[PDB]
Amino acid sequence: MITAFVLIRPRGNRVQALGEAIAELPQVAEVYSVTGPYDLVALVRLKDVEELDDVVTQGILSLEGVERTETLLAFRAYPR
Amino acid sequence: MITAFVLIRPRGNRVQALGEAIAELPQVAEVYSVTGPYDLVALVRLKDVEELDDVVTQGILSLEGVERTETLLAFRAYPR
Amino acid sequence: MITAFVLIRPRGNRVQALGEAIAELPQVAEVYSVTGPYDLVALVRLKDVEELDDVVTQGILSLEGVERTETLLAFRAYPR
Amino acid sequence: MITAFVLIRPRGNRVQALGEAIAELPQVAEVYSVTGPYDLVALVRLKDVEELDDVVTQGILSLEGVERTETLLAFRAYPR
Amino acid sequence: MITAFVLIRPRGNRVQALGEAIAELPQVAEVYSVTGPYDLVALVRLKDVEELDDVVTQGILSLEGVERTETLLAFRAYPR
Amino acid sequence: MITAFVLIRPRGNRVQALGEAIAELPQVAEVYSVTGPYDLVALVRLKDVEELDDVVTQGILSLEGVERTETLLAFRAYPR
Amino acid sequence: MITAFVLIRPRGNRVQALGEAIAELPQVAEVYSVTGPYDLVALVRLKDVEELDDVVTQGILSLEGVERTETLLAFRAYP
Amino acid sequence: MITAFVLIRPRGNRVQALGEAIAELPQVAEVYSVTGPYDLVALVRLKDVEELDDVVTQGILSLEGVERTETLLAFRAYPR
Amino acid sequence: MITAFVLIRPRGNRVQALGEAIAELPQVAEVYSVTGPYDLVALVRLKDVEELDDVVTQGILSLEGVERTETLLAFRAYPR
Amino acid sequence: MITAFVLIRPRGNRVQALGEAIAELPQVAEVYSVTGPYDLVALVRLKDVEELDDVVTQGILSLEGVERTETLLAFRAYPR
Ligand SMILES: [Zn+2]
Ligand SMILES: [Zn+2]
Ligand SMILES: [Zn+2]
Ligand SMILES: [Zn+2]
């Protein structure tokens, strides 16, 4: 069941609201403020890859004050 | 509990072996091969941030074939 | 026939609008929403490199919300 | 049937060879020598997302002389 | 205490204003105008990781004129 | 006394070795393993600018394993 | 006679306008629209180095909607 | 005497004006329009490094049209 | 006729060798040593874009030292 | 006279030797160890631009342990 990490660069004074908003998106398992060149990361479980359309194109990129998105799509798991 | 996302660039031919190895380190909840500028991502759960010494400096950076590493430390969770 | 891969970075809330706009253009064979640094990627087929002025500068770049383009034109094919 | 564009930087001498070794991978529909920061592009057609491991990790990256790989995975198409 | 290095790129006319304001924050032990790509660096001391939210997201990023912030969080010290 | 922040990117297996060695140099007040693109940061205190040669060129860069250094030199402190 | 290649990033709609207004500069031997991180290239011909001010600062950068310019100046030829 | 090289990216239409403005600043021995990813370079002579406050923070960054600045502080001369 | 601008980054002590080596190739109309990130720039003149494999992949990339190429192919000329 | 600033990235343990060597080069007015992403800067006065062939291509790139160079050529002075 497909995993993705969405790296989100918001506007400084949007971080809290954008994090609270993104937590509500059905496919989003976890979301955090992180150190580094991106300010938020969303851990997202998809039933299919088309669902990045719903959670990123629509869920995330349609939110006011998001500047840049980068999706790291997991294609092989290493369990145990 | 402190979450981090460790982004890892191995030498090409070392992806699988490094993925399998990183999976066995205790603090490593999940690891995947991903699309993007990095090739693997480990999702890590820590009791203290110091444990990044154990998991990244020692655990990961001591493995041969790991060219670059970048840790996105989560400092705030957005649940619910 | 000359192939080109056109990478498009649209404004966030314009991804769907521009993907659909680009699919209309006669030279575009396929166009997708993709993971990575460019939200859209058009697979373009061309009579001659000259025609890329009509698809890129006229066709794509005239549209509102296109921040960046980057055309990867193909000069040698590997058949079978 | 998932589409992905694999961006490949090979060592300069290996280019015309590596392309011919890429073409003969099972999942590669089209493969080109291109202008830009990546020398080869592979148009891949996948059964699922997990089949990226077969075409990239255990495929493209296995081969001698491939320096970098970047996969742009298509999750939504735009018809017409 | 946890140590962090907060790298701040202000709008150019805001350097002094932002500098003096960051120095008022309880967690900031030292803050400087520096050479390099970030005009201000804050040396911060934290009770926990979570306190980074109070200093960066609520404290610095709430301020007028801050373009980018980048936190380097110290997980291990080397004494002597 | 001038302050500088020295950003050290070591070879991954050298992190601790270099950490401990940099801690020995008389001008280094604090040195840490950090998150980010540079594994080590040294907080240095200088008698004059020229003393940077002693710490960086003769001191850090004369050590086995250091890939890149970047010095952020503080020319103005903001008190309170 | 100094050669330089001026790399120009225009605003997306301005490309065809600027491209035609670049050619109309006294020093521009041939301006093209190209692939890559820069949309226009100006192959310039100079009497001396100071004449870059004429063709770039007072030339190209005086036109509406030029976002970035990068000049690669030729200092040696290989026959 | 402490030397620095200040690299200045102005707005296009401000280059000339800013070059003339920066020339009048006391500590500025020479200024030029240059080739490269920066447009102006001021060569600066300082009695103390604090003086970068006067010349850069105040002198330069307070001029309108200056988009990015970068200071290369010289900490060792090689005469003869 | 199709004009291309080829940018070459040779190994340092190979600049003169490759510049003179590039100048022989039949399609190369001009080649210079230049300021910037790429030491050499060939002005190439092609009959068909398929000829870039001759000039770049075998013609330029086969030679020792050439660390990186980037071809700016032209698709629209501006006359007068 | 034509002015140029040559930014030199040497190998860590080469800085001093390369700084001393570059200083004896006839066209080199001043050379310094500097802070930032480049380690040395050479301030160079030329009678003609071809002289970058003697100072840079030969004078500098021929020296062992120089990794990258970038020349910012001054084309207009702003005196006073
Ligand atoms: Zn959907
Ligand atoms: Zn530990
Ligand atoms: Zn002062
Ligand atoms: Zn000469």
JSON list of N, CA and C in Angstrom, two decimals, chain G residues 3 5 7 15-17 19-20 23-24 28 30-38 40-41 43 45 70-79, chain I residues 3 5 7 15-16 19-20 23-24 30-41 43 45 70-80:
[
{"chain": "G", "resi": 3, "resn": "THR", "atom": "N", "xyz": [34.37, 38.39, -28.70]},
{"chain": "G", "resi": 3, "resn": "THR", "atom": "CA", "xyz": [33.10, 37.68, -28.71]},
{"chain": "G", "resi": 3, "resn": "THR", "atom": "C", "xyz": [32.59, 37.43, -27.28]},
{"chain": "G", "resi": 5, "resn": "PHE", "atom": "N", "xyz": [28.84, 35.51, -25.41]},
{"chain": "G", "resi": 5, "resn": "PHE", "atom": "CA", "xyz": [27.52, 34.90, -25.50]},
{"chain": "G", "resi": 5, "resn": "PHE", "atom": "C", "xyz": [26.74, 35.40, -24.29]},
{"chain": "G", "resi": 7, "resn": "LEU", "atom": "N", "xyz": [23.51, 35.13, -22.10]},
{"chain": "G", "resi": 7, "resn": "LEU", "atom": "CA", "xyz": [22.44, 34.23, -21.71]},
{"chain": "G", "resi": 7, "resn": "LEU", "atom": "C", "xyz": [21.33, 35.07, -21.10]},
{"chain": "G", "resi": 15, "resn": "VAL", "atom": "N", "xyz": [9.37, 36.55, -24.48]},
{"chain": "G", "resi": 15, "resn": "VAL", "atom": "CA", "xyz": [10.41, 35.89, -25.29]},
{"chain": "G", "resi": 15, "resn": "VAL", "atom": "C", "xyz": [10.48, 36.36, -26.76]},
{"chain": "G", "resi": 16, "resn": "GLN", "atom": "N", "xyz": [9.37, 36.26, -27.49]},
{"chain": "G", "resi": 16, "resn": "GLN", "atom": "CA", "xyz": [9.35, 36.64, -28.91]},
{"chain": "G", "resi": 16, "resn": "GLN", "atom": "C", "xyz": [9.51, 38.15, -29.13]},
{"chain": "G", "resi": 17, "resn": "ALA", "atom": "N", "xyz": [8.98, 38.95, -28.21]},
{"chain": "G", "resi": 17, "resn": "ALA", "atom": "CA", "xyz": [9.17, 40.39, -28.24]},
{"chain": "G", "resi": 17, "resn": "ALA", "atom": "C", "xyz": [10.66, 40.72, -28.04]},
{"chain": "G", "resi": 19, "resn": "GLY", "atom": "N", "xyz": [13.32, 38.83, -27.96]},
{"chain": "G", "resi": 19, "resn": "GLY", "atom": "CA", "xyz": [14.13, 38.20, -29.00]},
{"chain": "G", "resi": 19, "resn": "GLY", "atom": "C", "xyz": [14.28, 39.03, -30.27]},
{"chain": "G", "resi": 20, "resn": "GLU", "atom": "N", "xyz": [13.23, 39.78, -30.61]},
{"chain": "G", "resi": 20, "resn": "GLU", "atom": "CA", "xyz": [13.25, 40.65, -31.80]},
{"chain": "G", "resi": 20, "resn": "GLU", "atom": "C", "xyz": [13.87, 42.02, -31.50]},
{"chain": "G", "resi": 23, "resn": "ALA", "atom": "N", "xyz": [17.93, 41.43, -31.28]},
{"chain": "G", "resi": 23, "resn": "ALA", "atom": "CA", "xyz": [18.55, 41.47, -32.60]},
{"chain": "G", "resi": 23, "resn": "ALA", "atom": "C", "xyz": [18.79, 42.90, -33.09]},
{"chain": "G", "resi": 24, "resn": "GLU", "atom": "N", "xyz": [17.94, 43.82, -32.64]},
{"chain": "G", "resi": 24, "resn": "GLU", "atom": "CA", "xyz": [18.01, 45.22, -33.05]},
{"chain": "G", "resi": 24, "resn": "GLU", "atom": "C", "xyz": [19.02, 46.05, -32.27]},
{"chain": "G", "resi": 28, "resn": "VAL", "atom": "N", "xyz": [24.74, 42.80, -31.76]},
{"chain": "G", "resi": 28, "resn": "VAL", "atom": "CA", "xyz": [24.21, 41.44, -31.82]},
{"chain": "G", "resi": 28, "resn": "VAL", "atom": "C", "xyz": [24.34, 40.81, -33.21]},
{"chain": "G", "resi": 30, "resn": "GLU", "atom": "N", "xyz": [23.83, 37.59, -33.89]},
{"chain": "G", "resi": 30, "resn": "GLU", "atom": "CA", "xyz": [22.71, 36.64, -34.03]},
{"chain": "G", "resi": 30, "resn": "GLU", "atom": "C", "xyz": [22.12, 36.24, -32.68]},
{"chain": "G", "resi": 31, "resn": "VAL", "atom": "N", "xyz": [20.83, 36.52, -32.48]},
{"chain": "G", "resi": 31, "resn": "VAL", "atom": "CA", "xyz": [20.14, 36.11, -31.26]},
{"chain": "G", "resi": 31, "resn": "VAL", "atom": "C", "xyz": [19.16, 34.97, -31.55]},
{"chain": "G", "resi": 32, "resn": "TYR", "atom": "N", "xyz": [19.21, 33.94, -30.72]},
{"chain": "G", "resi": 32, "resn": "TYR", "atom": "CA", "xyz": [18.38, 32.75, -30.89]},
{"chain": "G", "resi": 32, "resn": "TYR", "atom": "C", "xyz": [17.50, 32.53, -29.68]},
{"chain": "G", "resi": 33, "resn": "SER", "atom": "N", "xyz": [16.46, 31.72, -29.89]},
{"chain": "G", "resi": 33, "resn": "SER", "atom": "CA", "xyz": [15.68, 31.13, -28.82]},
{"chain": "G", "resi": 33, "resn": "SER", "atom": "C", "xyz": [16.19, 29.70, -28.68]},
{"chain": "G", "resi": 34, "resn": "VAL", "atom": "N", "xyz": [16.55, 29.30, -27.47]},
{"chain": "G", "resi": 34, "resn": "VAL", "atom": "CA", "xyz": [17.19, 27.99, -27.24]},
{"chain": "G", "resi": 34, "resn": "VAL", "atom": "C", "xyz": [16.55, 27.17, -26.12]},
{"chain": "G", "resi": 35, "resn": "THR", "atom": "N", "xyz": [16.86, 25.88, -26.11]},
{"chain": "G", "resi": 35, "resn": "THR", "atom": "CA", "xyz": [16.53, 25.00, -25.00]},
{"chain": "G", "resi": 35, "resn": "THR", "atom": "C", "xyz": [17.40, 25.34, -23.79]},
{"chain": "G", "resi": 36, "resn": "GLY", "atom": "N", "xyz": [17.03, 24.83, -22.62]},
{"chain": "G", "resi": 36, "resn": "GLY", "atom": "CA", "xyz": [17.85, 24.97, -21.42]},
{"chain": "G", "resi": 36, "resn": "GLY", "atom": "C", "xyz": [17.32, 25.97, -20.40]},
{"chain": "G", "resi": 37, "resn": "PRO", "atom": "N", "xyz": [18.17, 26.32, -19.42]},
{"chain": "G", "resi": 37, "resn": "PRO", "atom": "CA", "xyz": [17.85, 27.18, -18.30]},
{"chain": "G", "resi": 37, "resn": "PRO", "atom": "C", "xyz": [17.79, 28.66, -18.66]},
{"chain": "G", "resi": 38, "resn": "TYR", "atom": "N", "xyz": [18.15, 28.98, -19.91]},
{"chain": "G", "resi": 38, "resn": "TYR", "atom": "CA", "xyz": [18.08, 30.33, -20.46]},
{"chain": "G", "resi": 38, "resn": "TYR", "atom": "C", "xyz": [17.35, 30.25, -21.78]},
{"chain": "G", "resi": 40, "resn": "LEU", "atom": "N", "xyz": [16.80, 32.81, -24.22]},
{"chain": "G", "resi": 40, "resn": "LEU", "atom": "CA", "xyz": [17.46, 33.48, -25.33]},
{"chain": "G", "resi": 40, "resn": "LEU", "atom": "C", "xyz": [18.99, 33.52, -25.21]},
{"chain": "G", "resi": 41, "resn": "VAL", "atom": "N", "xyz": [19.66, 33.36, -26.34]},
{"chain": "G", "resi": 41, "resn": "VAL", "atom": "CA", "xyz": [21.12, 33.57, -26.42]},
{"chain": "G", "resi": 41, "resn": "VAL", "atom": "C", "xyz": [21.45, 34.68, -27.43]},
{"chain": "G", "resi": 43, "resn": "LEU", "atom": "N", "xyz": [24.64, 36.14, -29.36]},
{"chain": "G", "resi": 43, "resn": "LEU", "atom": "CA", "xyz": [26.04, 36.14, -29.81]},
{"chain": "G", "resi": 43, "resn": "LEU", "atom": "C", "xyz": [26.44, 37.56, -30.20]},
{"chain": "G", "resi": 45, "resn": "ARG", "atom": "N", "xyz": [29.29, 40.88, -30.71]},
{"chain": "G", "resi": 45, "resn": "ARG", "atom": "CA", "xyz": [30.63, 41.20, -31.23]},
{"chain": "G", "resi": 45, "resn": "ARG", "atom": "C", "xyz": [31.05, 42.56, -30.72]},
{"chain": "G", "resi": 70, "resn": "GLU", "atom": "N", "xyz": [23.31, 36.47, -18.12]},
{"chain": "G", "resi": 70, "resn": "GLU", "atom": "CA", "xyz": [24.64, 35.89, -17.83]},
{"chain": "G", "resi": 70, "resn": "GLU", "atom": "C", "xyz": [25.57, 35.93, -19.05]},
{"chain": "G", "resi": 71, "resn": "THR", "atom": "N", "xyz": [26.68, 36.67, -18.92]},
{"chain": "G", "resi": 71, "resn": "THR", "atom": "CA", "xyz": [27.61, 36.86, -20.04]},
{"chain": "G", "resi": 71, "resn": "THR", "atom": "C", "xyz": [28.85, 35.97, -19.94]},
{"chain": "G", "resi": 72, "resn": "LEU", "atom": "N", "xyz": [28.97, 35.09, -20.93]},
{"chain": "G", "resi": 72, "resn": "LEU", "atom": "CA", "xyz": [30.13, 34.26, -21.12]},
{"chain": "G", "resi": 72, "resn": "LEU", "atom": "C", "xyz": [31.03, 34.95, -22.14]},
{"chain": "G", "resi": 73, "resn": "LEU", "atom": "N", "xyz": [32.08, 35.64, -21.67]},
{"chain": "G", "resi": 73, "resn": "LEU", "atom": "CA", "xyz": [32.97, 36.37, -22.58]},
{"chain": "G", "resi": 73, "resn": "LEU", "atom": "C", "xyz": [34.17, 35.55, -23.09]},
{"chain": "G", "resi": 74, "resn": "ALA", "atom": "N", "xyz": [34.30, 35.47, -24.41]},
{"chain": "G", "resi": 74, "resn": "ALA", "atom": "CA", "xyz": [35.42, 34.76, -25.05]},
{"chain": "G", "resi": 74, "resn": "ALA", "atom": "C", "xyz": [36.73, 35.57, -25.00]},
{"chain": "G", "resi": 75, "resn": "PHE", "atom": "N", "xyz": [37.72, 35.02, -24.31]},
{"chain": "G", "resi": 75, "resn": "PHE", "atom": "CA", "xyz": [39.03, 35.64, -24.21]},
{"chain": "G", "resi": 75, "resn": "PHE", "atom": "C", "xyz": [40.15, 34.94, -25.04]},
{"chain": "G", "resi": 76, "resn": "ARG", "atom": "N", "xyz": [39.92, 33.70, -25.48]},
{"chain": "G", "resi": 76, "resn": "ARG", "atom": "CA", "xyz": [40.81, 33.04, -26.44]},
{"chain": "G", "resi": 76, "resn": "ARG", "atom": "C", "xyz": [40.00, 32.26, -27.46]},
{"chain": "G", "resi": 77, "resn": "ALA", "atom": "N", "xyz": [40.40, 32.33, -28.72]},
{"chain": "G", "resi": 77, "resn": "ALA", "atom": "CA", "xyz": [39.82, 31.50, -29.78]},
{"chain": "G", "resi": 77, "resn": "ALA", "atom": "C", "xyz": [40.70, 30.27, -30.03]},
{"chain": "G", "resi": 78, "resn": "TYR", "atom": "N", "xyz": [40.09, 29.22, -30.58]},
{"chain": "G", "resi": 78, "resn": "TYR", "atom": "CA", "xyz": [40.82, 28.05, -31.05]},
{"chain": "G", "resi": 78, "resn": "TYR", "atom": "C", "xyz": [40.45, 27.88, -32.51]},
{"chain": "G", "resi": 79, "resn": "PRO", "atom": "N", "xyz": [41.36, 28.28, -33.43]},
{"chain": "G", "resi": 79, "resn": "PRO", "atom": "CA", "xyz": [41.21, 28.09, -34.87]},
{"chain": "G", "resi": 79, "resn": "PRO", "atom": "C", "xyz": [41.13, 26.61, -35.26]},
{"chain": "I", "resi": 3, "resn": "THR", "atom": "N", "xyz": [21.64, 25.80, -35.47]},
{"chain": "I", "resi": 3, "resn": "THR", "atom": "CA", "xyz": [22.67, 26.29, -34.56]},
{"chain": "I", "resi": 3, "resn": "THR", "atom": "C", "xyz": [22.49, 25.74, -33.15]},
{"chain": "I", "resi": 5, "resn": "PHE", "atom": "N", "xyz": [24.62, 25.79, -29.19]},
{"chain": "I", "resi": 5, "resn": "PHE", "atom": "CA", "xyz": [25.68, 26.32, -28.34]},
{"chain": "I", "resi": 5, "resn": "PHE", "atom": "C", "xyz": [26.05, 25.20, -27.39]},
{"chain": "I", "resi": 7, "resn": "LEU", "atom": "N", "xyz": [28.34, 23.88, -24.35]},
{"chain": "I", "resi": 7, "resn": "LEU", "atom": "CA", "xyz": [29.15, 24.35, -23.24]},
{"chain": "I", "resi": 7, "resn": "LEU", "atom": "C", "xyz": [29.90, 23.15, -22.70]},
{"chain": "I", "resi": 15, "resn": "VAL", "atom": "N", "xyz": [42.05, 22.13, -20.81]},
{"chain": "I", "resi": 15, "resn": "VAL", "atom": "CA", "xyz": [41.24, 23.17, -21.45]},
{"chain": "I", "resi": 15, "resn": "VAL", "atom": "C", "xyz": [41.75, 23.41, -22.86]},
{"chain": "I", "resi": 16, "resn": "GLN", "atom": "N", "xyz": [43.05, 23.73, -22.97]},
{"chain": "I", "resi": 16, "resn": "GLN", "atom": "CA", "xyz": [43.67, 24.03, -24.27]},
{"chain": "I", "resi": 16, "resn": "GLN", "atom": "C", "xyz": [43.61, 22.85, -25.23]},
{"chain": "I", "resi": 19, "resn": "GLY", "atom": "N", "xyz": [39.80, 22.33, -26.35]},
{"chain": "I", "resi": 19, "resn": "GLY", "atom": "CA", "xyz": [39.41, 23.45, -27.21]},
{"chain": "I", "resi": 19, "resn": "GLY", "atom": "C", "xyz": [39.90, 23.28, -28.63]},
{"chain": "I", "resi": 20, "resn": "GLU", "atom": "N", "xyz": [41.18, 22.91, -28.77]},
{"chain": "I", "resi": 20, "resn": "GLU", "atom": "CA", "xyz": [41.82, 22.66, -30.07]},
{"chain": "I", "resi": 20, "resn": "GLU", "atom": "C", "xyz": [41.29, 21.37, -30.71]},
{"chain": "I", "resi": 23, "resn": "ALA", "atom": "N", "xyz": [37.83, 22.16, -32.09]},
{"chain": "I", "resi": 23, "resn": "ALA", "atom": "CA", "xyz": [37.90, 23.06, -33.25]},
{"chain": "I", "resi": 23, "resn": "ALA", "atom": "C", "xyz": [38.07, 22.32, -34.58]},
{"chain": "I", "resi": 24, "resn": "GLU", "atom": "N", "xyz": [38.63, 21.11, -34.52]},
{"chain": "I", "resi": 24, "resn": "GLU", "atom": "CA", "xyz": [38.80, 20.28, -35.72]},
{"chain": "I", "resi": 24, "resn": "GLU", "atom": "C", "xyz": [37.48, 19.74, -36.28]},
{"chain": "I", "resi": 30, "resn": "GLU", "atom": "N", "xyz": [32.81, 27.75, -34.51]},
{"chain": "I", "resi": 30, "resn": "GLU", "atom": "CA", "xyz": [33.63, 28.59, -33.64]},
{"chain": "I", "resi": 30, "resn": "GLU", "atom": "C", "xyz": [33.75, 27.88, -32.28]},
{"chain": "I", "resi": 31, "resn": "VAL", "atom": "N", "xyz": [34.87, 28.08, -31.59]},
{"chain": "I", "resi": 31, "resn": "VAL", "atom": "CA", "xyz": [35.01, 27.59, -30.22]},
{"chain": "I", "resi": 31, "resn": "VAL", "atom": "C", "xyz": [35.97, 28.46, -29.45]},
{"chain": "I", "resi": 32, "resn": "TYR", "atom": "N", "xyz": [35.55, 28.86, -28.26]},
{"chain": "I", "resi": 32, "resn": "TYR", "atom": "CA", "xyz": [36.29, 29.83, -27.46]},
{"chain": "I", "resi": 32, "resn": "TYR", "atom": "C", "xyz": [36.51, 29.36, -26.05]},
{"chain": "I", "resi": 33, "resn": "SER", "atom": "N", "xyz": [37.51, 29.98, -25.43]},
{"chain": "I", "resi": 33, "resn": "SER", "atom": "CA", "xyz": [37.75, 29.88, -24.01]},
{"chain": "I", "resi": 33, "resn": "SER", "atom": "C", "xyz": [37.01, 31.08, -23.42]},
{"chain": "I", "resi": 34, "resn": "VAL", "atom": "N", "xyz": [36.22, 30.84, -22.37]},
{"chain": "I", "resi": 34, "resn": "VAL", "atom": "CA", "xyz": [35.26, 31.84, -21.86]},
{"chain": "I", "resi": 34, "resn": "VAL", "atom": "C", "xyz": [35.29, 31.97, -20.34]},
{"chain": "I", "resi": 35, "resn": "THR", "atom": "N", "xyz": [34.86, 33.14, -19.85]},
{"chain": "I", "resi": 35, "resn": "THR", "atom": "CA", "xyz": [34.55, 33.32, -18.43]},
{"chain": "I", "resi": 35, "resn": "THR", "atom": "C", "xyz": [33.33, 32.43, -18.07]},
{"chain": "I", "resi": 36, "resn": "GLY", "atom": "N", "xyz": [33.13, 32.17, -16.79]},
{"chain": "I", "resi": 36, "resn": "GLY", "atom": "CA", "xyz": [31.91, 31.47, -16.39]},
{"chain": "I", "resi": 36, "resn": "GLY", "atom": "C", "xyz": [32.09, 30.11, -15.75]},
{"chain": "I", "resi": 37, "resn": "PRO", "atom": "N", "xyz": [31.02, 29.28, -15.75]},
{"chain": "I", "resi": 37, "resn": "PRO", "atom": "CA", "xyz": [31.06, 27.92, -15.18]},
{"chain": "I", "resi": 37, "resn": "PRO", "atom": "C", "xyz": [31.55, 26.86, -16.16]},
{"chain": "I", "resi": 38, "resn": "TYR", "atom": "N", "xyz": [31.60, 27.21, -17.44]},
{"chain": "I", "resi": 38, "resn": "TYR", "atom": "CA", "xyz": [32.02, 26.27, -18.48]},
{"chain": "I", "resi": 38, "resn": "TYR", "atom": "C", "xyz": [33.16, 26.89, -19.28]},
{"chain": "I", "resi": 39, "resn": "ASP", "atom": "N", "xyz": [34.35, 26.28, -19.20]},
{"chain": "I", "resi": 39, "resn": "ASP", "atom": "CA", "xyz": [35.57, 26.87, -19.76]},
{"chain": "I", "resi": 39, "resn": "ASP", "atom": "C", "xyz": [35.55, 27.06, -21.27]},
{"chain": "I", "resi": 40, "resn": "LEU", "atom": "N", "xyz": [34.82, 26.18, -21.96]},
{"chain": "I", "resi": 40, "resn": "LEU", "atom": "CA", "xyz": [34.75, 26.21, -23.42]},
{"chain": "I", "resi": 40, "resn": "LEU", "atom": "C", "xyz": [33.31, 26.32, -23.89]},
{"chain": "I", "resi": 41, "resn": "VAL", "atom": "N", "xyz": [33.12, 27.04, -24.99]},
{"chain": "I", "resi": 41, "resn": "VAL", "atom": "CA", "xyz": [31.84, 27.14, -25.67]},
{"chain": "I", "resi": 41, "resn": "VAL", "atom": "C", "xyz": [32.01, 26.98, -27.18]},
{"chain": "I", "resi": 43, "resn": "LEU", "atom": "N", "xyz": [30.38, 27.05, -30.79]},
{"chain": "I", "resi": 43, "resn": "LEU", "atom": "CA", "xyz": [29.26, 27.39, -31.67]},
{"chain": "I", "resi": 43, "resn": "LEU", "atom": "C", "xyz": [29.24, 26.32, -32.75]},
{"chain": "I", "resi": 45, "resn": "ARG", "atom": "N", "xyz": [27.17, 24.15, -35.89]},
{"chain": "I", "resi": 45, "resn": "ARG", "atom": "CA", "xyz": [26.22, 24.37, -36.98]},
{"chain": "I", "resi": 45, "resn": "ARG", "atom": "C", "xyz": [25.88, 23.02, -37.61]},
{"chain": "I", "resi": 70, "resn": "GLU", "atom": "N", "xyz": [26.82, 20.61, -21.76]},
{"chain": "I", "resi": 70, "resn": "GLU", "atom": "CA", "xyz": [25.42, 21.03, -21.76]},
{"chain": "I", "resi": 70, "resn": "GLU", "atom": "C", "xyz": [25.12, 21.77, -23.05]},
{"chain": "I", "resi": 71, "resn": "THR", "atom": "N", "xyz": [24.25, 21.20, -23.88]},
{"chain": "I", "resi": 71, "resn": "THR", "atom": "CA", "xyz": [23.96, 21.78, -25.18]},
{"chain": "I", "resi": 71, "resn": "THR", "atom": "C", "xyz": [22.69, 22.63, -25.18]},
{"chain": "I", "resi": 72, "resn": "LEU", "atom": "N", "xyz": [22.86, 23.90, -25.52]},
{"chain": "I", "resi": 72, "resn": "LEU", "atom": "CA", "xyz": [21.77, 24.84, -25.73]},
{"chain": "I", "resi": 72, "resn": "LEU", "atom": "C", "xyz": [21.42, 24.86, -27.22]},
{"chain": "I", "resi": 73, "resn": "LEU", "atom": "N", "xyz": [20.55, 23.94, -27.63]},
{"chain": "I", "resi": 73, "resn": "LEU", "atom": "CA", "xyz": [20.09, 23.87, -29.01]},
{"chain": "I", "resi": 73, "resn": "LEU", "atom": "C", "xyz": [19.09, 24.97, -29.33]},
{"chain": "I", "resi": 74, "resn": "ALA", "atom": "N", "xyz": [19.26, 25.61, -30.48]},
{"chain": "I", "resi": 74, "resn": "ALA", "atom": "CA", "xyz": [18.36, 26.68, -30.92]},
{"chain": "I", "resi": 74, "resn": "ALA", "atom": "C", "xyz": [17.26, 26.15, -31.83]},
{"chain": "I", "resi": 75, "resn": "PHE", "atom": "N", "xyz": [16.04, 26.67, -31.65]},
{"chain": "I", "resi": 75, "resn": "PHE", "atom": "CA", "xyz": [14.88, 26.25, -32.43]},
{"chain": "I", "resi": 75, "resn": "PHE", "atom": "C", "xyz": [14.16, 27.44, -33.10]},
{"chain": "I", "resi": 76, "resn": "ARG", "atom": "N", "xyz": [14.68, 28.64, -32.87]},
{"chain": "I", "resi": 76, "resn": "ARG", "atom": "CA", "xyz": [14.16, 29.84, -33.51]},
{"chain": "I", "resi": 76, "resn": "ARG", "atom": "C", "xyz": [15.24, 30.90, -33.64]},
{"chain": "I", "resi": 77, "resn": "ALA", "atom": "N", "xyz": [15.50, 31.31, -34.88]},
{"chain": "I", "resi": 77, "resn": "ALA", "atom": "CA", "xyz": [16.43, 32.39, -35.19]},
{"chain": "I", "resi": 77, "resn": "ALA", "atom": "C", "xyz": [15.73, 33.74, -35.24]},
{"chain": "I", "resi": 78, "resn": "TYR", "atom": "N", "xyz": [16.42, 34.79, -34.80]},
{"chain": "I", "resi": 78, "resn": "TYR", "atom": "CA", "xyz": [15.92, 36.16, -34.90]},
{"chain": "I", "resi": 78, "resn": "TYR", "atom": "C", "xyz": [16.81, 36.98, -35.84]},
{"chain": "I", "resi": 79, "resn": "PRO", "atom": "N", "xyz": [16.28, 37.32, -37.03]},
{"chain": "I", "resi": 79, "resn": "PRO", "atom": "CA", "xyz": [17.03, 38.00, -38.09]},
{"chain": "I", "resi": 79, "resn": "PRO", "atom": "C", "xyz": [17.14, 39.51, -37.88]},
{"chain": "I", "resi": 80, "resn": "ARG", "atom": "N", "xyz": [17.95, 40.16, -38.73]},
{"chain": "I", "resi": 80, "resn": "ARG", "atom": "CA", "xyz": [18.23, 41.62, -38.69]},
{"chain": "I", "resi": 80, "resn": "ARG", "atom": "C", "xyz": [19.28, 41.97, -37.64]}
]
